């Protein structure tokens, strides 16, 4: 089966270059087309590119014509997309795709299609600088339905760049909890919240803690979130 | 350049039925070269059905492609659970590929209302300067809702940003958050501060709201 492993997620500012390399394992290298396929965050999917190895071929998307370049190096089985000029639009997961095939080696058929994909790779462009987020509670309402439901969470505010992962009592919380999509504001900076709904009874005497992890600033913080004393 | 365009652009149906998606281009593509692909979030796309008709050994034989020269169409004769994600075509007869913009199909169920929640900005946050208050939206169907933030009585617009979870795997609903940021100055200059909800499971507009300092 063929593997496609991309490089690390990747983090830049406006007006430069980057370069994501797609490492081709398995199957062959040089006679099925290894395309690049971009998605910004909560859009579609977006044909950059593609390349026939062995044929030194590229095809390029107009939208990208100048700026992109894509390269297949068959002595190390991978193919690279630098994409240069970078502006905050072109902030997406960049995934490599290569055609499948009927059978294998160079004497495989090509379908064209893209059946194999690597995990993807996060660019994401920006003039902020790496920033690990506040964690402000949102605290259980003191007007909270006694016998009933109560809502409470965490504000994980002012970060970047993406991904932030949040938990509950370090795992131990899984029903109700909503860890909404993050906004980006207009300062540049992350922002998302991670709500849980619970029973009001629980509201004096369970302790709810949320986990918050962001590895891109390398900052892990774990918030307490308590009624207001009023 | 040719252009696909999928629809509808959200399908709703339930649990077995049978889901038949449109891709529809704008000029012939040649020798059937059209592609589906699922997508699930978090997860790279999925090829599902290749040459408008053949389908990659390891994908379920309910999924069926059909059609030709500007009109194709994807089917699922019965739909899975795990059948309930995004669907992308694609056109590659030219050098210069193309997808489509996507369908996303999702679970029908029984209208739901949003249990309404509102939260002051923290102590923690003031001492900082600005004040965030976020107004929880949990747990309703179908996705579409609006929410109206009034401080004062008076109807805001541009301080304010909304974010939709997924639809969940276990109760098909859906979740809103919307977050109303002032600077700590702006946020002191007034008392009341309120969300309206509307939705199709609600008959009334909801408004859950809060004085500042109580
Ligand atoms: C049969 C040989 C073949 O298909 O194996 C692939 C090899 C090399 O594999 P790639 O580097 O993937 O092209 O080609 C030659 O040996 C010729």
């Known amino acids: 089966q063929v593997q496609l492993v991309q490089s690390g997620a990747e983090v830049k500012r406006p007006g430069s270059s980057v370069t994501v390399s797609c490492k081709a394992s398995?199957?062959?290298?040089?006679?099925?087309?290894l395309s690049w396929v971009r998605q910004a965050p909560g859009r579609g999917l977006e044909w950059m590119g593609g390349?026939?190895?062995?044929?030194?071929?590229?095809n390029y998307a107009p939208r990208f014509q100048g700026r992109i370049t894509i390269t297949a190096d068959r002595s190390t089985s991978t193919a690279y997309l630098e994409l240069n000029s970078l502006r905050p639009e072109d902030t997406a997961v960049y995934y490599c795709?290569?055609?499948?095939?009927?059978?294998?080696?160079?004497?495989?058929?090509?379908?064209?299609?893209?059946?194999?994909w690597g995990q993807g790779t996060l660019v994401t462009v920006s003039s902020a600088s790496t920033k690990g987020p506040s964690v402000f509670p949102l605290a259980p309402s003191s007007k909270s339905t006694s016998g009933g439901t109560a809502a409470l969470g965490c504000l994980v505010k002012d970060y970047f760049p993406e991904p932030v992962t949040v938990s509950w009592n370090s795992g131990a919380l899984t029903s109700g909890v909503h860890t909404f999509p993050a906004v980006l504001q207009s300062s540049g900076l992350y922002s998302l919240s991670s709500v849980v709904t619970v029973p009001s009874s629980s509201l004096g005497t369970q302790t709810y803690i949320c986990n918050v992890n962001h590895k891109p600033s390398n900052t892990k913080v774990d918030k307490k979130v308590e009624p207001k004393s009023c | 350049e040719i252009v696909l365009t999928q629809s509808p652009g959200t399908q709703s149906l339930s649990p077995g039925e049978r889901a038949t998606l449109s891709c529809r281009a704008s000029?012939?593509?040649?020798?059937?070269?059209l592609a589906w692909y699922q997508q699930r979030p978090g997860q790279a796309p999925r090829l599902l059905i290749y040459?408008?008709?053949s389908r990659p050994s390891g994908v379920a034989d309910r999924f069926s492609g059909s059609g030709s020269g500007t009109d194709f169409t994807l089917t699922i004769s019965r739909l899975e659970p795990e059948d309930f994600a995004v669907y992308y075509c694609?056109?590659?007869?030219?050098?210069?590929?193309?997808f489509g913009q996507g369908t996303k199909v999702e679970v029908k169920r029984t209208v739901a209302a949003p249990s309404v929640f509102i939260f002051p900005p923290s102590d923690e946050q003031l001492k900082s300067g600005t004040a965030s208050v976020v107004c929880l939206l949990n747990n309703f169907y179908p996705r579409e809702a609006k929410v109206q933030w009034k401080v004062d009585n008076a109807l805001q617009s541009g301080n304010s940003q909304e974010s939709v979870t997924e639809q969940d795997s276990k109760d098909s609903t859906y979740s809103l958050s919307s977050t109303l940021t002032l600077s700590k100055a702006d946020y002191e200059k007034h008392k009341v501060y309120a969300c309206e909800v509307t939705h199709q499971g609600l008959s009334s507009p909801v408004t859950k709201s809060f004085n500042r300092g109580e």
């Open positions: 795709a290569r055609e499948g095939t009927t059978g294998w080696g160079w004497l495989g058929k090509p379908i064209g299609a893209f059946a194999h």
């Open positions: 398995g199957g062959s290298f040089s006679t099925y087309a």
């Open positions: 390349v026939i190895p062995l044929l030194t071929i590229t």
């Open positions: 000029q012939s593509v040649g020798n059937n070269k």
């Open positions: 040459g408008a008709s």
């Open positions: 694609q056109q590659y007869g030219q050098s210069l590929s193309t």
